[PDB]
Write a protein that binds this ligand. Sequence first.
Ligand code: NAG
Ligand code: NAG
Ligand code: NAG
Ligand code: NAG
Ligand code: NAG
Ligand code: NAG
Ligand code: NAG
Lengths: 249, 49, 49, 299, 50
Amino acid sequence: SQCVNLITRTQSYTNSFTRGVYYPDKVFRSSVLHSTHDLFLPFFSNVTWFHAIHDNPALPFNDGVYFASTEKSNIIRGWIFGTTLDSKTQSLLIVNNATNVVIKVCEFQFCNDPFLDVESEFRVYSSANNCTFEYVSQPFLMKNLREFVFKNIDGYFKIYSKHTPINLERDLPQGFSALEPLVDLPIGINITRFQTLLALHRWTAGAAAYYVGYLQPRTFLLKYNENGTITDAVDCALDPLSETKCTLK
Amino acid sequence: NHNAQALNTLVKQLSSKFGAISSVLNDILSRLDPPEAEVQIDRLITGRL
Amino acid sequence: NHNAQALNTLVKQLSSKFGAISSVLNDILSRLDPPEAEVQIDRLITGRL
Amino acid sequence: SFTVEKGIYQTSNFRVQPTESIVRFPNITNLCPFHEVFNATTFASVYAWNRKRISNCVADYSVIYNFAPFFAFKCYGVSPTKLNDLCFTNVYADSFVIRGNEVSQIAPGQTGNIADYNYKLPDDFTGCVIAWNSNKLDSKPSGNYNYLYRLLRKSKLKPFERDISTEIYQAGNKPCNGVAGPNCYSPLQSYGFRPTYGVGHQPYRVVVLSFELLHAPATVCGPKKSTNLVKNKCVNFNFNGLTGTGVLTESNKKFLPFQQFGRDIADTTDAVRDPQTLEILDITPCSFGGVSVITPGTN
Amino acid sequence: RKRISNCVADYSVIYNFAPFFAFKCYGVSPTKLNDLCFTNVYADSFVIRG
Ligand SMILES: *[C@@H]1O[C@H](CO)[C@@H](O)[C@H](O)[C@H]1NC(C)=O
Ligand SMILES: *[C@@H]1O[C@H](CO)[C@@H](O)[C@H](O)[C@H]1NC(C)=O
Ligand SMILES: *[C@@H]1O[C@H](CO)[C@@H](O)[C@H](O)[C@H]1NC(C)=O
Ligand SMILES: *[C@@H]1O[C@H](CO)[C@@H](O)[C@H](O)[C@H]1NC(C)=O
Ligand SMILES: *[C@@H]1O[C@H](CO)[C@@H](O)[C@H](O)[C@H]1NC(C)=O
Ligand SMILES: *[C@@H]1O[C@H](CO)[C@@H](O)[C@H](O)[C@H]1NC(C)=O
Ligand SMILES: *[C@@H]1O[C@H](CO)[C@@H](O)[C@H](O)[C@H]1NC(C)=O
């Protein structure tokens, strides 16, 4: 039909501790200490807690995005990336459901508050006319916490994902949990802002919460045990002790 | 410890590129012209020497 | 005097060309193709090493 | 010397020589559609360049010479004669039409209108560029006007980035309001192609082939026969273009499903995954040692 | 031989005057000519065989 505005949002801040570590390459290593320089999430930094209840969800993208969701009702699905969120520029339309994922790059005319009728996308964009990039695959989303990392380098969009069981806790847990790559695509467009989609039945009151953080170019020291897994990491630009540890390897 | 560290450093030095396209001789041999791959092997030889 | 002379020689060594077109990195960077300026920087790096 | 005194001398080393050779390639039976990339009788403009993905096929580059009347290849990371042996993951083909004097701008680390506003290549590019004259097809006596290029963009383009938006570029403080008055311009201009121009002002068709190194399971490479698999012997092996010699044994390592290779401290491959059967194998250098000779004086 | 001095040099327009293929420079690069600042320019012109 037409665009409607029915979503409100609230913000808070919290600490990230040591989260957001992913395998930098598809190479097996064991019982070693490796040094990497890449886009990572710095230790002990602000992460924004967003509460959506039923609004300008066009949050900046910057170099990369770290997303965390601890819900279970499967209210969260899909993402939009772009530079102006209009029909004059191409944009991403990642959409997820229980059976498939469709990634489309076209010149959509996005609404101010996009969502799903639930199962139509007329509330998201008015129409898409001229484009080339389409892709279909198995859906990404499958007491539990789901962590995602999105970035783009040299026209290549890369996504990392991880699932981890958690107990009754009101904040992010303590420990290490590596992330594994899932999708790399030739995006080749300009990205400045990104948004979030929700599916609302009919409407009905809805509530959701998530954690958002930003990545920065950093040097990390990872420890590979005898078993192929990453169990410890050191950030070399946190405090003089960590810098000394990185220098001494 | 001095001898152990010296041997470990000597072994670790084999992973350097020294300005070439790769640190593995087989990749250079299989990816480049035989009359052209010599200028890549020369850098590795000089560095190891 | 030995230490003074050694330090003075080490400082004076920075004005050599080592077969490149110039002894200043900024001139090479501003006058040459970025994929081409590397072969000039390599000589300076090797000489200083 | 012809005389040796009493003592012990270190002479050389002994090694074990390989017995045979092993080649292991995955099941690929289709043929890569390099034919459709060329002879398309329609080439897009430089500002809107096409991109085609090639995967899961056998690539025979030697037939490419039969489709277009170009002179020679121009490759950077590899050699044209060695393309039939390497095995990549993905291939990308881009095609467009430019002027004669701008062909030099399609290269890593280049500067120019086309380089920073239409098509940009990364500084670590690994691929090939093929350009050939097309004056007999893209020129008209009145003047062709179906090919356009962008003049003025606010910033410089990133590598492998495409721009399609058509707006009114502003050069002053006043807003343009969608009209082409003073200090307001159109961003695209059309090439003027005529058959009476010089070689430097004639149309040229350009095709860029970009390859991806081995990080994921390979999908594209030439027709090389695959032999059987032997173990516990000093043999030469070739796994998806990775060549070496040694002894192959069963591996107890637990590779993750997205991992394909294993490295050691000295940055050498020691564990491999067979392309046909998803099995992990360990590589060990063949037996070797040092030999010393003990002798009294030659008198 | 022509002497060029006391003027702003825009080499990018040179491609619009003659139908040549590419430059051939030795001490500098063709793409970096718009940033360097010289003292004098000299232009020589003639006709030879192929
Ligand atoms: C996080 O951001 C807020 C406001 O932007 C600031 O007051 C605070 O010092 C920052 N750091 C932490 C640890 O909250
Ligand atoms: C999920 O989306 C895909 C993409 O259109 C669609 O083909 C599929 O039917 C959807 N799943 C369900 C259960 O409707
Ligand atoms: C896409 O863009 C072109 C160029 O601006 C325009 O002519 C065309 O109408 C648009 N839509 C489609 C479906 O091609
Ligand atoms: C990408 O989009 C941003 C948003 O306006 C713009 O500032 C920038 O110039 C564009 N291009 C690049 C290469 O970032
Ligand atoms: C290593 O992985 C194996 C896989 O089953 C597991 O049995 C073992 O407990 C692991 N050891 C450590 C120290 O993680
Ligand atoms: C393919 O290219 C050849 C060039 O020799 C041409 O003869 C042939 O007609 C082309 N095939 C097409 C356009 O289908
Ligand atoms: C490749 O083909 C061989 C012979 O048909 C077969 O044994 C093997 O299972 C195939 N590989 C895969 C991954 O299916």
